[PDB]
Amino acid sequence: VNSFSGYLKLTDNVYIKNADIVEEAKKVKPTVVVNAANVYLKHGGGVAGALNKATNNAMQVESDDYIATNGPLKVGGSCVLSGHNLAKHCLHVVGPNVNKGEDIQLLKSAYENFNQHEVLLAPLLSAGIFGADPIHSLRVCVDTVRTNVYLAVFDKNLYDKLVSSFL
Ligand SMILES: OC[C@H](CN1CCCCC1)Nc1ncnc2[nH]ccc12
């Protein structure tokens, strides 16, 4: 039993809700919130910009030190950093950005990072401003993640479209 509320159950392990991931994380304080990151951990917009804003830029400050030490992430890769005031940990995961010409096949590799954590609050990777098809992102999530994932979908029409089209 966990403290996630109001989710629709899609499979044995994948749950979905229409919600702002920032507000969800503040309420639940999950062990892990997933950020839709880029390789430079520059949290400018989308989920990343919103999560960073909610930390009063502390996420960005921590991220800049991470990059200065380690260099950029790989597309499809991840790192674990602090969750600040939102969660215990933030798993920064880089899905391919179609608006940069990155290979969509890397979306499966990106979701594989979730399997290192028993329970996660997450967005749909490569959706939104990353330019991929969200129906596809959900399909890959369900077919790749085996741990318990609580998906927060920002947009209501998308959420309803995602639920109504789910196989
Ligand atoms: O897939 C990621 C989605 C993309 N979404 C954005 C709205 C329009 C349709 C596409 N972004 C978010 N998902 C959950 N919480 C969020 N907080 C801020 C952004 C955000």
Ligand SMILES: [Cl-]
């Ligand atoms: Cl977005």
